[PDB]
Design a protein around this ligand. Structure first.
Ligand SMILES: Nc1nc2c(ncn2[C@@H]2O[C@H](COP(=O)(O)OP(=O)(O)OP(=O)(O)O)[C@@H](O)[C@H]2O)c(=O)[nH]1
Ligand SMILES: Nc1nc2c(ncn2[C@@H]2O[C@H](COP(=O)(O)OP(=O)(O)OP(=O)(O)O)[C@@H](O)[C@H]2O)c(=O)[nH]1
Ligand SMILES: Nc1nc2c(ncn2[C@@H]2O[C@H](COP(=O)(O)OP(=O)(O)O)[C@@H](O)[C@H]2O)c(=O)[nH]1
Ligand SMILES: [Mg+2]
Ligand SMILES: [Mg+2]
Lengths: 427, 146, 426, 51, 221, 427, 49
C-alpha cells in the first residue's frame, strides 16, 4: 500500500523539505539513506542498505530545488526526481499553465509513470502547492489534469495553501486563486485548506512563539500529513485508509474542501504541567482558535467530521469524548447528517524533531472536518477578485501571455456556482 | 505477496549488492591435494579451489598434466556454495543452503581436511593475496600461512 | 541560468555603474584583479548572473560601456576595479553629443549604435537564459538619454520577450545643471513609456537631502550619491544571486507592480541608512526598517509620496528574519495609512525575504513604490518644456539636426496624457 | 627483458634519433646501440670522444 | 563531534551568512534575565535556519555545554555567555574600557580565503605527503608537456543538475572519470586515494575540490 | 571454440583499442600479456605464460597503428599482427579498393591464414570498419570479398559505423557508403549497424556527460561486442552461439541488417538510487532513445529479435518481462513471424573498465534486432547520393584512380533493389 | 585609439629620435671567437660584433 507525493512550487517543495525530514526520523532512516517494514509505503528499498522516497520535487526556477541538491539531504533523493526549469512563472498563472508548463509537464508525468509501476499497491497521490503563486497554482493545475485522465481512479489528495484575508505576499493572488480553483474544483478528490495567517496565530497562542518564520509553519504542517497517513505505516486499533476520506467527507461531488486542525500544540515546558488526556484534546481540536484555516466555523454547520488519534488512546473514551461533543450545543451539524463522525485510532505516538518546537506527547488528534463555513472563504476571495477585475487591472499580463478574457468571466461564475451550492447544501 | 504482485526477486531476498560491490573480483585460491590411492584404481591428484568473496561460492578447478590419462575437462565442481553438512534431501525442492550451513573463508586453515562431497581434500598452499587477506582480516600469524 | 547584461550610457551612467561593480564585486568577494578572494561558498553559485569565468579564476563583468567622448572611458579605468572590464566592451565614439538629444539619437547613434548592438548581441547570445537587460543612464544629458534611448528601441524589437530595467536619474529645478533639460527629458520620456518595461526614477535633488538629514554627511561628493544608488540596484537583484525564503525574481516583481501597461515609473528607497554617529545608538529590527522605509523623506525622488496614493508597493528584505514579523508589518502600514493606498486594489504590498544580507549588514531592505505622486515630477517638467518651447528658444540645435516641430508637439502631447491618466486613477 | 617505454617495437615506422648509423643488428639491439653505445660504434665517437 | 568542532563550525556559519540570532532568542525570555529554556534554545537556532547546516548531534552538544542548573531540579542555558562568543566572532565589545588592545579585521581561524587557490590541508604521515607531492609533480609535468587544460573538463560534471552539486567540487566517481577518460593520462587507485584525501572536503567527505586540484596541478601563470 | 576478429580502418582499429582493453582485464590478463580456460576464445596462450590476442590491425596510414605500438598495450599485441602501409586511402573508396588494396591485402589474408592455423574450432569472423572511410570501405570490401572465397561457409558479423543522418565528418561520405554497401550485401551474413550521433545521444541522456568524445563512444561499443559474445567465453543457463545469428536473425539472404541496444546505461551516482530489475532493463532496450543507430524502430516492424542477458538473472522474469513486450501496441511485429524472440542468459556480470563512466551493475541486457526501419536509412542516404551524382561531383577522384562510371550507376541500382525489399517485406 | 584615428607610429611609442640624434653613427665593434671544435665536424671560427 504505497503512495507517491509530488511537490510543486516554492511553498510546496519547501513544506516537503520538512515532511521528509520528519519521515526519515519516523523510520530511523539517516539522511544518507541507510538504516543502522513500515517504510515500504514511502521508501522503495533499493540496492542494499538504501531507501529512496516516492517523491518528485518540481518547479520552474532552480533556486529552491538546487538548494536541496546541496542541502543535507543530497544523497537521500534520486537526482532524476528533482526537476527544475529555467525561468519562473512569476506569479502569472497563464505563464506557468500555457507557456512554460507546456514544455515541462511532459517531462514531469513521464517520470511519475516510472514511479507508479515501481510501486505495487498504489493507493493514490498526494500533492502540495500554494494556490497564490503562479507555478504552484498554474502548472499545479495543469499537472493534475493529465493525472486524472491517465489514472482516473487513484485518489488525489491536494494539500493546498490558500491566501489569507489580511496577511498576503502578492497582489495578483486573487486572480491566481480563482483561476486555480476553476480546475481543482473538479479534478482533485480531497482538497485540504491551510492558511499562513491562521497558522501564525497557533504558534503565538499555544507555542508562545512571537516571531515564527516559515520554518515553523512548514514543520507543524508535516505533523498533519504524518498523522492522517500513519494509518498505513503503523497498524492501528481502528484503521482508516486514503479512500475512506474520499467517501466519508464528500457529501456531493463538488464540496471537497476540508478544514484541518490538530492538537495538542504544546511546548516542552508546558508539556510537564498539562495533564494530557483524551477528553480535552478532543475539545482542543474543535475550538475555532485551533484550525489551520482562517474562518469562524460557528457561522456554519459541520457537514461531517473526521478524527485521527495517535499514541496511547483506548477507544472506550473516544466514544465518550465524541459523545460529549454532540451534547454540546455551541457546535451544530447539518440536518442532512445525523451520524457525523469518522473515528480513527492509531498506535504509534507522534514523533519529535531534535531542534523542533513540539514536545513528546503521549497522544495527539488530527481533525479533518467539512463545514459550510468554507463558503465564506470563497465568498471572500470572489469579492476581492471582482474589485480588481472591474478595472481590468493586471489583466493585460494574463491576456498578454496568450490567454483571453474568456477564462476570467467563466471562472468568476464557477465560484458563483460553488457558493450557490454551499448556501444550498446548508439548508 | 509482493512476489505475486510484481517485485524484483533480488530485492525480495535482500542484502546481495552490498557484498558484491565491496568484493567484486576477490577470489581466494587454494591448492588442494586429494589423496585417493587407497581405492582399487587411480591415484592421488592435485586440484585448486576458488572461494569467491562476492558470493561465498566454491569452484574446484582441476589442473591437467601433459600426457595424463585423463580426458581434458576444464572444471571439476560447479560454482555453487559448498554444503559442508549432510541434509535430509526432499525430492521436490533442491535444498536451500544457508550461509551458516555452508563453508566460510574462516574454515580453511592450511593443513586441514575439507569434506567436499565426501571427498576429503587436503589443502596445502595458498596465493600471496590469500595469505595477505588472512593476515589482514582473520588475524592469522605468519607461521600459519606457511 | 538567469542572466543580466548591463549597459551604461553617458557620463552619468558610467560613473554610477562603476560604483555598481565595485559594490557587487565585494558582495561576491573578488578583488580588483578579478580573482576570487571571498570566504562563503554561497558567493559563487550565482556569479554567472553577473560575471563570466575567463581563465583560471578570472571573472569579467557582463557590462558594455558606451559614450561619445573618450574622457569618461579614461576615468572609469582610473579608479580601483577598473582593471576588471573586458576592453572589447569599451565601445565609444569620439566627437561628443554636447548635451543635444538630437545629436545622440540621430547623428552619432547613426554611426556608433550599429557597433554597440554588435557587442550587445554577442553578450546576449553568449549566455543561455536571458532574464533581461539593465541600462544605467540619465534623462537630461545628450548622450545619456538620446543615445541610450535609441539603443533601447533597437532592442525591444530584438528581444521582445525579456524584461528591461533602466535606472535613470531625472532633472529637478533645484539641481538644474544643463539648460536644455526640459527639451531632453520630455524627448526621452516619450520613448521609455513605449519600449522600456519599467524604470526606477532617481534624481540628484533627493539624494542630497538624504546625505544631509539622515547620513549627516558634510560634503557629499558624487562618490557617495553614486554609492547610494549602487546599493539599490544591487538589492533589486538579490533574489537571483542568493537563496531566500520567499524568492521573487525580476519578472515576479514587474507583474506585481504594473497594473496597466503605461504605468511603470517607480520610486525607490533603501534602509537602513544611518550616519556613522547614530549607527552605534539605534535599534535594528524589522519595524525600524519599515518606519525608515515608508518615511517620505527616504524616497530617492523629489516627489512627496504623501501627496498621492500608492497604486502598489514592494519591499525586498534581506537577512534572516521572521516572515510573520515581516508581513504583519506591511499589514499595519496599510491599515493605518489607509488613505494613501488605492481602494480598488486590495493588499497593495508585496513582501520578499532573502537569506543573504548585504556585505557587513545583518539586515537590510529595499523599497519600490509605484505611486501616483510621481506625476508631479512630470508636471514640473512638462511646464518647463512648454515654457521654453512657446518661444522656440534653443530649438535651432534640434531642428538643425533632423527633428521637426511636430515631434516636440507630439512628445509633450504624450507626456500630457500620461499625467492625465495618473490623475485619472486618483 | 627490454620492456620500458623507451624501447620500441620492431614494426616502428616512427623516427628514432640515429638509426642511419647502424648495421647488422636487430632493431631492439639497435635502439640499445644509440642510448648506451659500445666503444667501437660510431654513435659513441660522435658524442663522448675528445676532439 | 566534540565541542570545539561544533563551536567553530557554528562560528563559521554565522559569520559567513551574517545571521542575527539575538532576535530569535530575546522573544523567548520576556524578562531579560538570560537563562532561556533548552527547548527555546534549540528553537531559536531552528528559526535562524542553522538546522540545515549543522547536525542535530552538534546542536545537542552545544546545548549540553551551555546548560546550567539554575536549581537542583531546574536546568536552563544562559544565552548571555553564548551570545558573548557570537559577537566575539564579529568584533570585541566594550572597546572603550581598553583602547590599547588591537582587534583584527576578521577572524582568521574560521576563514580560508584561498581554499580555491591552494590546498591548505596536510597529511600527517610524512611518506604520505611525500607520495602526494610526487604524483602531482609527475602529473604537472605531463600536463605541461601535452598542453592540456584541466579545469575546463570538470565544469561539465559540476554544472549539471543530475549530480549532487556543490560549487568547486565533484564527487569521487566523476572525478576519476574526468581523470582518465577526458584527460589522457592514467593514474592508479592508490594515487587516486591520495589525490582524494588531500582535496577532500571536511564538511561533506565525498566532494573533491577540482578547482584547487587544477590550480595546483598547473598554475595559471 | 575460437573466434578471430579483424579491425580495418581508422575507426575499426580504435574500437579494437577499446574492445581489447576490456577483454584483457575481464579475464584478468595484465596489459603486458600474462597473469599475476575461458580466454581460449580470444587469447592464445604461448610458451611459458604469455597470452597473445587473436586479432589483426591493418590500416594504410601508419599514424594510428604505431601509436598502439607505443601506447600502453605494447607487450600485448604481437609485432606482426599490426599491419601498416605507407600512405592512406583519403576517403576515396576506389583508391582503397584497387590501387593500394591489391598491394597489402594478400599480405593480410596470408597472415589470417596462419591465424586459423593455431586455431582449431574457429567459430567465425567479425569485422570493424567505418563504411564512410577510405580503408573501412575499400580494404574491407576488398578483404571481405577475398575471405568469402577462402572459407565461404563461415559466418561474418559486421560492426560497421555508418554516417549519421545530419551529423557528418567528411564530405564524400555518401559515395563511399553506397560503394561498400554494394559489396556488404553478398558477403556479410549478419551486419550490426552502428551510428555516431545515436551514441552521442546516449552519452548525453543517460551518462549525462555533456561534451563526450570518441573514447567515451568506443568504450560502450566494446560493451555490446563483449555482451553478444559472452556465451562462448563463459557458462550460462541458456546460451546462444555465434551461429544462432546466422539462423535466428536472417529470414532472407539479403535482409541482414540489425539494430543494437544496450541497457542499463547508468553512471555511478544515479546507480544505487535506481532499482535495477529485469522488468525495466528489458524495457530500457526498447525505447527508441536507447539504440545505437539513429532510426525510429516504431516506423517499421521487427522481423526478429535476440536478447542476450548477463549476470544474476533468473530465467523466470525474463519470460514475464518479454511477455509484456508482445502486449504493447506501440511496437508491432511482422505477421510473417509470430514468434521472434531469442533469449540468451549468461552468468557473468558486466565488467567495468577502471575509471569508466559506467557503474558496477549486477546484470545487463543487449538486444540485437532486425527490423524494417533500417530500410529508411538506406533511403535517406540514397537520396543524398543522387544529388552529388547529377553534378558528377567528386567523381574525377574515382575515375582518375582507375575505377569507372558503371559501378556508380549500378551500386545505385543495387541499393535500389534493397529499398523495394524493405518496402515489400514490410507489407 | 590614436593609432586608429591616424597618428605617427613612431610618436606612439616615443623616445626614439633622441638617441638617434646623439648617437647617429656610433658603433662598438668587437672581435669574438666562437669555439665549436667539440662538435662532430667543423672547427672554431672568428666573427665580429
Ligand atoms: N506555509 C508556507 N507557505 C509558503 C512558504 N513559502 C511560500 N509560501 C506561500 O506561497 C505563496 C506564493 O506561492 P509560492 O509557492 O511562494 O510561489 P510559487 O507558487 O512557487 O510561484 P512562483 O513564485 O512564480 O515560483 C506565498 O503567498 C506564501 O504565503 C512556506 O515556506 N510555508
Ligand atoms: N564511433 C567512432 N567512430 C569513429 C572513430 N574513429 C573514426 N570514426 C569514424 O570514421 C569516420 C571517418 O572515416 P575513417 O575511418 O576515419 O577513415 P578511414 O576509413 O580510416 O579511411 P582513410 O582516412 O582514408 O584512411 C568518421 O565519420 C568517424 O565517425 C571512433 O573511434 N569511434
Ligand atoms: N548621481 C550622479 N549624477 C551625476 C554624476 N555625474 C553627473 N551627474 C548628473 O548627470 C547630469 C547630466 O548628465 P550627463 O552626464 O551630462 O549626460 P550625458 O552628457 O548625455 O552623458 C547632471 O545634471 C548631473 O547631475 C554622478 O557621479 N552621480
Ligand atoms: Mg514560486
Ligand atoms: Mg583512415
Amino acid at each position: 500500500r504505497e503512495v507517491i507525493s509530488i511537490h510543486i512550487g516554492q511553498a510546496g517543495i519547501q513544506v516537503g523539505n520538512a515532511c521528509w525530514e520528519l519521515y526519515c526520523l519516523e523510520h530511523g532512516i539517516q539522511p544518507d539513506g541507510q538504516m543502522p517494514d513500515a517504510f515500504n509505503t514511502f521508501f522503495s528499498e533499493t540496492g542494499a542498505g538504501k531507501h529512496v522516497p516516492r517523491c518528485i520535487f518540481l518547479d520552474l526556477e532552480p533556486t529552491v530545488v538546487d538548494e536541496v541538491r546541496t542541502g543535507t539531504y543530497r544523497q537521500l533523493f534520486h537526482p532524476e526526481q528533482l526537476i527544475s526549469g529555467k525561468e519562473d512563472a512569476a506569479n502569472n498563472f497563464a505563464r506557468g499553465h500555457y507557456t512554460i508548463g507546456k514544455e515541462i509537464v511532459d517531462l514531469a508525468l513521464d517520470r511519475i509513470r516510472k514511479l507508479a509501476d515501481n510501486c505495487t499497491g498504489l493507493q493514490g497521490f498526494l500533492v502540495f502547492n500554494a494556490v497564490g503563486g503562479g507555478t504552484g497554482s498554474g502548472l499545479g493545475s495543469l499537472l493534475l489534469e493529465r493525472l486524472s485522465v491517465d489514472y482516473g481512479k487513484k485518489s488525489k489528495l491536494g494539500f493546498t495553501v490558500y491566501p489569507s484575508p489580511q496577511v498576503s505576499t502578492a497582489v495578483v493572488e486573487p486572480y491566481n486563486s480563482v483561476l486555480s480553483t476553476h480546475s481543482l474544483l473538479e479534478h482533485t478528490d480531497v482538497a485540504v485548506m491551510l492558511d499562513n495567517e491562521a497558522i501564525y496565530d497557533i504558534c503565538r497562542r499555544s507555542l508562545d512563539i512571537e516571531r515564527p518564520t516559515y520554518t515553523n509553519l512548514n514543520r507543524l504542517i508535516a505533523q498533519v500529513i504524518s498523522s492522517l497517513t500513519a494509518s498505513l505505516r503503523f497498524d492501528g486499533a481502528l484503521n482508516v485508509d486514503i479512500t475512506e476520506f474520499q467517501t466519508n467527507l464528500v457529501p456531493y461531488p463538488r464540496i471537497h474542501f476540508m478544514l484541518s486542525s490538530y492538537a495538542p500544540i504544546i511546548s516542552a515546558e508546558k508539556a510537564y504541567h498539562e495533564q494530557l488526556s483524551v477528553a480535552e484534546i478532543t475539545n482542543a481540536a474543535f475550538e475555532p482558535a485551533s484550525m489551520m484555516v482562517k474562518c469562524d466555523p460557528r457561522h456554519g454547520k459541520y457537514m461531517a467530521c473526521c478524527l485521527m488519534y495517535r499514541g496511547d488512546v483506548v477507544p472506550k473514551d473516544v466514544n465518550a469524548s465524541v459523545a460529549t461533543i454532540k451534547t454540546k450545543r455551541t457546535i451544530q451539524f447539518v440536518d442532512w447528517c445525523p451520524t457525523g463522525f469518522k473515528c480513527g485510532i492509531n498506535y504509534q505516538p507522534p514523533t519529535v524533531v531534535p531542534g523542533g518546537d513540539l514536545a513528546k506527547v503521549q497522544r495527539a488528534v488530527c481533525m479533518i472536518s467539512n463545514s459550510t463555513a468554507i463558503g465564506e472563504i470563497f465568498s471572500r476571495l470572489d469579492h476581492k477578485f471582482d474589485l480588481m477585475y472591474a478595472k481590468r487591472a493586471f489583466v493585460h499580463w494574463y491576456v498578454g501571455e496568450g490567454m483571453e478574457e474568456g477564462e476570467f468571466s467563466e471562472a468568476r461564475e464557477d465560484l458563483a456556482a460553488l457558493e450557490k451550492d454551499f448556501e444550498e447544501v446548508g439548508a | 505477496v509482493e512476489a505475486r504482485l510484481g517485485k524484483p526477486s533480488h530485492l525480495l531476498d535482500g542484502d546481495r549488492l552490498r557484498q558484491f560491490l565491496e568484493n567484486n573480483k576477490k577470489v581466494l585460491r587454494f591448492w588442494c591435494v586429494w589423496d585417493e590411492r587407497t581405492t582399487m584404481y587411480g591415484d592421488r591428484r592435485p586440484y585448486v579451489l576458488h572461494y569467491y568473496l562476492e558470493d561465498d561460492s566454491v569452484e574446484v578447478l582441476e589442473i591437467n598434466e601433459n600426457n595424463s590419462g585423463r580426458d581434458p575437462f576444464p572444471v571439476f565442481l560447479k560454482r555453487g556454495p559448498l554444503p559442508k553438512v549432510a541434509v535430509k534431501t526432499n525430492t521436490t525442492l533442491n535444498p536451500k543452503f544457508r550461509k551458516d550451513q555452508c563453508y566460510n573463508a574462516g574454515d580453511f586453515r592450511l593443513g586441514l581436511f575439507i569434506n567436499v562431497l565426501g571427498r576429503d581434500f587436503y589443502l596445502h598452499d595458498a596465493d600471496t593475496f590469500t595469505k595477505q587477506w588472512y593476515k589482514d582480516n582473520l588475524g592469522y600469524t605468519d607461521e600459519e600461512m606457511s | 541560468m538567469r542572466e543580466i547584461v548591463h549597459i551604461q550610457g553617458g557620463q552619468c551612467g558610467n560613473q554610477i555603474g562603476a560604483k555598481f561593480w565595485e559594490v557587487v564585486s565585494d558582495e561576491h568577494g573578488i578583488d580588483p584583479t578579478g580573482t576570487y578572494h571571498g570566504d562563503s561558498d554561497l558567493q559563487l553559485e550565482r556569479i554567472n548572473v553577473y560575471f563570466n569565468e575567463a581563465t583560471g579564476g578570472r571573472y569579467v563583468p557582463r557590462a558594455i560601456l558606451m559614450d561619445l567622448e573618450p574622457g569618461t572611458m579614461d576615468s572609469v579605468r582610473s579608479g580601483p576595479y577598473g582593471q576588471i572590464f573586458r576592453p572589447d566592451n569599451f565601445v565609444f565614439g569620439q566627437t561628443g553629443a554636447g548635451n543635444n538629444w538630437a545629436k545622440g539619437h540621430y547623428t552619432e547613434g547613426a554611426e556608433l549604435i550599429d557597433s554597440v548592438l554588435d557587442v550587445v548581441r554577442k553578450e546576449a547570445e553568449s549566455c543561455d537564459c536571458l532574464q533581461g537587460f539593465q541600462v544605467c543612464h540619465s534623462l537630461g544629458g545628450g548622450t545619456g538619454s538620446g543615445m541610450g534611448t535609441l539603443l533601447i528601441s533597437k532592442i525591444r524589437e530584438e528581444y521582445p520577450d525579456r524584461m528591461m530595467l533602466t535606472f535613470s536619474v531625472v532633472p529637478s529645478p533645484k539641481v538644474s545643471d544643463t539648460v536644455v533639460e526640459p527639451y531632453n527629458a520630455t524627448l526621452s520620456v516619450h520613448q521609455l513609456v513605449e519600449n522600456a518595461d519599467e524604470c526606477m526614477v532617481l534624481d540628484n535633488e533627493a539624494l542630497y537631502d538624504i546625505c544631509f538629514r539622515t547620513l549627516k554627511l558634510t560634503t557629499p561628493t558624487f562618490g557617495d550619491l553614486n554609492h547610494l544608488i549602487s546599493a539599490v540596484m544591487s538589492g533589486i537583484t538579490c533574489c537571483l544571486r542568493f537563496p531566500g525564503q520567499l524568492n521573487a525574481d525580476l519578472r515576479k516583481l514587474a507583474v506585481n507592480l504594473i497594473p496597466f501597461p503605461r504605468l511603470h515609473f517607480f520610486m525607490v528607497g533603501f534602509t537602513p541608512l544611518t550616519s556613522r554617529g547614530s549607527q552605534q545608538y539605534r535599534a535594528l529590527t524589522v519595524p525600524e526598517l519599515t518606519q525608515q522605509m515608508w518615511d517620505a523623506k527616504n524616497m530617492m525622488c523629489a516627489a512627496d509620496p504623501r501627496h498621492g496614493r500608492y497604486l502598489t508597493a514592494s519591499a525586498l528584505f534581506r537577512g534572516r528574519m521572521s516572515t510573520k514579523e515581516v508581513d504583519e508589518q506591511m499589514l499595519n502600514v496599510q491599515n493605518k495609512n489607509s488613505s494613501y493606498f488605492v481602494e480598488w486594489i486590495p493588499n497593495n504590498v508585496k513582501s520578499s525575504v532573502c537569506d543573504i544580507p548585504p556585505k557587513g549588514l545583518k539586515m537590510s531592505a529595499t523599497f519600490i513604490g509605484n505611486s501616483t505622486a510621481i506625476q508631479e515630477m512630470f508636471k514640473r517638467v512638462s511646464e518647463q518644456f512648454t515654457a521654453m518651447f512657446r518661444r522656440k528658444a534653443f530649438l535651432h540645435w534640434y531642428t538643425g539636426e533632423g527633428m521637426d516641430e511636430m515631434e516636440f508637439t507630439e512628445a509633450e502631447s504624450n507626456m500630457n496624457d500620461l499625467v492625465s491618466e495618473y490623475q485619472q486613477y486618483q | 627483458p627490454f620492456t620500458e617505454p623507451e624501447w620500441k617495437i620492431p614494426g616502428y615506422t616512427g623516427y628514432v634519433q640515429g638509426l642511419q648509423e647502424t648495421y647488422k643488428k636487430t632493431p631492439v639491439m639497435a635502439q640499445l646501440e644509440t642510448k648506451d653505445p659500445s666503444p667501437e660504434s660510431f654513435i659513441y665517437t660522435r658524442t663522448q670522444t675528445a676532439p | 563531534v566534540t565541542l570545539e568542532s561544533a563551536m567553530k563550525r557554528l562560528k563559521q556559519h554565522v559569520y559567513k551568512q551574517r545571521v542575527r540570532v539575538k532576535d530569535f532568542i530575546m522573544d523567548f525570555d520576556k524578562l531579560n534575565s538570560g537563562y532561556v529554556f533548552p527547548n527555546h534554545f534549540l528553537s531559536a537556532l531552528s528559526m535562524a535556519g542553522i538546522d540545515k547546516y549543522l547536525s542535530p548531534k552538534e546542536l545537542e552538544v552545544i546545548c549540553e555545554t551551555y546548560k546550567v542548573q539554575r536549581d537542583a531540579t531546574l536546568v536552563m542555558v544562559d544565552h548571555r555567555t553564548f551570545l558573548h562568543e557570537l559577537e566575539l566572532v564579529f568584533t570585541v565589545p566594550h572597546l572603550e574600557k581598553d583602547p590599547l588592545v588591537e582587534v583584527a579585521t576578521e577572524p582568521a581561524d574560521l576563514l580560508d580565503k584561498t581554499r580555491y587557490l591552494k590546498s591548505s590541508r596536510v597529511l600527517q604521515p610524512p611518506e604520505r605527503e611525500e607520495a602526494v607531492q610526487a604524483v602531482i609533480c609527475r602529473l604537472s609535468d605531463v600536463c605541461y608537456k601535452r598542453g592540456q587544460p584541466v579545469k575546463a573538463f570538470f565544469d561539465d560534471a559540476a554544472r549539471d543538475d543530475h549530480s549532487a552539486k556543490l560549487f568547486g567540487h565533484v564527487t569521487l566517481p566523476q572525478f576519476r572519470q574526468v581523470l582518465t577518460t577526458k584527460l589522457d593520462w592514467v593514474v592508479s587507485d592508490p594515487e587516486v586515494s591520495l589525490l582524494a584525501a588531500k582535496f577532500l572536503h571536511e564538511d561533506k567527505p565525498e566532494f573533491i575540490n577540482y578547482i584547487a586540484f587544477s590550480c595546483t596541478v598547473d598554475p595559471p601563470e
